[PDB]
Design a protein around this ligand. Structure first.
Ligand SMILES: CO[C@H]1C[C@@H]2CC[C@@H](C)[C@@](O)(O2)C(=O)C(=O)N2CCCC[C@H]2C(=O)O[C@H]([C@H](C)C[C@@H]2CC[C@@H](O)[C@H](OC)C2)CC(=O)[C@H](C)/C=C(\C)[C@@H](O)[C@@H](OC)C(=O)[C@H](C)C[C@H](C)/C=C/C=C/C=C/1C
Length: 107
């Protein structure tokens, strides 16, 4: 599944709805491995629409339980991420992913 551990609390009231755009910053790394991506480096926040299957399942379920302002460590098992195939060139088969995700804003 996806485990959500809080780094800094959000407001505890404003949670994403299906169909809303979540605006986030993230850093991704392989569990006890390499950092492979960060929107912070790029100075540009990542946006995705919750519930449209644009992103991996662990993000869909993980971000849905976060409130605005929250920063959390998401640990995502391979079956909630890229599974036995991985993501070619970047994520190997059967990788556990850890993301640091900060929910900035909803649009
Ligand atoms: C350059 O950076 C990439 C993101 C990179 C790619 C490689 C991975 C390691 C990674 O580094 O991100 C990464 O850290 C990662 O694993 N992410 C990104 C952050 C959210 C979680 C995860 C992810 O789900 O990636 C996604 C993962 C790689 C693929 C998806 C996994 C779930 C599955 O349901 C989807 O099937 C459809 C495919 C990539 C994304 O988050 C982007 C936004 C979404 C898509 C490409 C598809 O959903 C696409 O389908 C046609 C769409 O509907 C989109 C919106 C259409 C518009 C025009 C395309 C925008 C493309 C943006 C691409 C971006 C910023």
């Amino acid at each position: 599944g996806v485990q959500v551990e809080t780094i800094s609390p959000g407001d505890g009231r404003t949670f994403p709805k299906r169909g809303q755009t979540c605006v986030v910053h993230y850093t991704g790394m392989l569990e006890d491995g390499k950092k492979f991506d960060s929107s912070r480096d790029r100075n540009k926040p990542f946006k995705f629409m919750l519930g449209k299957q644009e992103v991996i399942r662990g993000w869909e379920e993980g971000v849905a339980q976060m409130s605005v302002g929250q920063r959390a460590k998401l640990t995502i098992s391979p079956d909630y991420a890229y599974g036995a195939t991985g993501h070619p060139g970047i994520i190997p088969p059967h990788a556990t992913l850890v993301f640091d995700v900060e929910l900035l804003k909803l649009e």
